[PDB]
Amino acid sequence: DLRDYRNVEVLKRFLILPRTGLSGKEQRILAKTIKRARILGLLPFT
Template sequence: MANFTGSRREKKKYVPKRKVCPFCVDRSRKIDYKEVDALRRFISDRGKMEPRHRTGVCAKHQRILSVTLKRARFLALLPYTSEHARSANVTSVPRKEPPQPA
């Protein structure tokens, strides 16, 4: 049978490993709105900012990151939502030809 201590089972609690802020570890790494590929790591597939507990960014750099993401969105480097990303990739838009003189 299972090991019982009194009337309760002994359970091991799951303690997740604390994530380390990538900007605190590498001091030379700056948060720049022009580095779109680096910023995509911090937004979800829906275009929303990922929370701190998921990315591991500290509070100080999360505030800087949110301003930087908003700036990149304003300059149309990043989409506001996933719908913007899909509509921006449309390359073939049917155009109306001007009427030909008869």
């Protein structure tokens, strides 16, 4: 689920890597998840 912003496990993987076999539509969606996780402090900005 490219939307679940708590799966550090999986999300971890894409750290934001440029099109990550992700597609134009998958990406971005990703990115917002990733950007939500970050605020939660789940993922890192830098």
